[PDB]
């Protein structure tokens with residue numbers, strides 16, 4: 001395969017469906033990326049992740065650089081080898097988790113922080129850590145602007161991000177092995193302000209990336225406002241490259257985002273809430289800990305093709321979660337990631353068949 | 369298959385190898401039974417348990433009767449259906465865990481206790497709970513005599529156990545469906561005293577069971593003393609029925625026990641210590657959390673055929689366990705149960721080939 005090729009096979013409105021071809025495999029778009037925090041998609045073997053239909057996973061740079069360490073993973077052969085996932089891996093650039101999870105000192109150079117011991121991240125180190133991990137899709141080092149932000153603060157933050165975007169580009173390009181085998185995505189910032197989003201889009205396009213993220217959303221603004229910002233922001237991005245909305249989201253968030261032009265998603269919601277007892281169903285989420293499932297012999301979801309729904313009942317999984325059993329986390333997680341992959345498959349198919357608008361409407365009437 | 373048929377195919381000294389045929393499957397002996405505490409072998413899907421080579425698992429009556437409940441499991445179709453294990457299940461009779469895990473009041477009728485809310489166990493209720501769970505091999509309700517015990521106390525306790533053994537027999541036999549489809553094992557008691565062991569053996573034989581456990585060991589007496597007691601105790605049991613040593617044990621315990629006539633084993637050591645970071649290897653156990661494995665690319669064990677050793681390194685599993693990741697528990701557990709099944713396979717094969725004595729010696733020189 002090529003280093004990177006994005007092809008759009010079909011369109012409906014702003015929605016697109018297609019493929020990203022990369023050396024380690026093909027990514028069907030719109031894609032959902034299960035999250036591998038610390039070199040594991042929690043409670044799943046990689047074969048199980050693959051079995052659910054995932055084409056690519058995300059790795060968190062912040063966690064990895066702290067434990068087990070990027071240089072160590074490099075010494076051991078790279079993240080793919082280490083965790084046993086041989087398909088593409090997208091790595092985040094680390095700043096978002098630094099600011100939300102670590103003491104910190106921000107500067108034009110980057111950020112120094114204390115592990116939750118003293119560490120540094122900058123455009124150059126971020127890009128080098130992603131290289132050491134052997135990431136397929138490298139994210140530019142950015143600043144996710146807190147919400148709400150005043151226009152002045154949003155602008156200052158966005159401008160720094162665009163300076164860091166150029167630095168990220170140059171660091172990536174300076175490393176031949178990385179530039180020849182990996183892709184680099186830029187991240188748009190600008191909070192909820194259309195002109196700042198535009199300036200950011202322009203800056204990123206002039207630098208040039210393999211793909212473009214819409215950064216700075218799903219940070220407390222709510223779905224209405226996130227959709228409003230996507231409405232004007234995604235058309236600013238190059239049409240012929242993938243559009244990634246990081247940290248999103250609930251099933252309806254994903255559907256609405258695809259309607260507005262997004263091709264890629266990641267979120268911990270299916271894994272984390274699965275361990276928390278929340279199961280996604282076509283009729284909306286259920287909390288399996290609830291007493292009403294204690295004798296319910298139906299599967300988590302009536303239609304789901306996953307192995308969990310083929311084999312075990314709500315009543316059993318209720319018991320496991322109640323009991324704090326590891327197999328409960330395993331089964332809930334497998335189902336929820338399978339459910340997300342089936343959602344993405346239905347989106348892809350409906351776009352390919354020009355019935356996505358109808359799918360979105362049907363999905364919503366039943367889910368709610 | 370028959371309800372119950374034990375065949376001995378080969379003998380070496382006191383060791384035997386053969387098969388137990390039951391309606392839900394064949395059990396290769398000497399057998400190791402992974403423990404399913406609360407309707408799950410911790411951190412493993414039942415298919416994974418089967419993949420390691422297990423033919424039968426144990427279920428804990430105490431835990432099940434408390435959560436989710438025996439009657440509830442019965443309503444839902446039985447333990448096999450509930451947890452997704454379609455092969456034989458041996459259920460313990462519950463007293464051992466009552467006395468070690470629950471406030472309690474002991475009487476000739478049985479034991480009342482408070483869940484760790486008020487519950488009762490007796491020969492009759494124990495046998496009924498095992499029926500409700502749909503157990504294949506039912507254990508008589510006994511009293512595991514604490515160690516050390518004076519001869520008087522050992523005798524009093526053993527005598528009660530033998531009265532309870534008769535009550536267990538009669539309760540089992542009174543339930544046609546149970547008597548036609550399940551087997552009943554009696555448990556020998558008597559602490560470390562040869563004459564009490566003999567009286568117990570005699571009592572159990574006169575009642576008549578499908579199999580005989582050596583109860584009251586692995587309760588603090590140490591291997592030397594456990595082997596000494598097995599030396600005289602196992603020959604007292606009927607030769608033509610299975611001999612079960614419950615709660616044993618370490619690999620060397622198992623080897624030594626087979627040398628003395630034991631055909632069946634259960635223990636939490638491979639599962640619990642696996643989650644604790646202890647991995648069994650042919651060169652002895654290792655603690656994977658130790659820093660010396662942080663960059664060790666070898667599998668947990670050099671020879672092990674399990675899927676974990678085919679695919680992941682010590683260094684990765686070290687990281688997972690260090691990080692408290694669920695996949696670490698999963699992988700450690702799968703390896704350790706596979707290791708135990710491979711140990712049992714080597715024992716069976718060596719007995720069948722009349723080289724067990726040599727295997728035991730070789731095993732020991734390398735393991736220690």
Ligand SMILES: CNc1nc2cc3nc(NC)[nH]c3cc2c(=O)[nH]1
Nearest residue numbers: 092093094096144215216217218247
């Ligand atoms: C690593 N860079 C980076 N990560 C993010 C993670 C997010 N996660 C959410 N909601 C869960 N919004 C996010 C925005 C960004 C963002 O703008 N940039």
Ligand SMILES: CNc1nc2cc3nc(NC)[nH]c3cc2c(=O)[nH]1
Nearest residue numbers: 460461462464512583584585586615
């Ligand atoms: C359920 N009846 C019953 N359980 C037991 C469990 C044991 N577990 C150990 N060591 C870990 N010894 C045991 C003895 C008995 C025993 O004599 N009887």
Ligand SMILES: [Zn+2]
Nearest residue numbers: 304306309335
């Ligand atoms: Zn499912």
Ligand SMILES: [Zn+2]
Nearest residue numbers: 672674677703
């Ligand atoms: Zn192994």
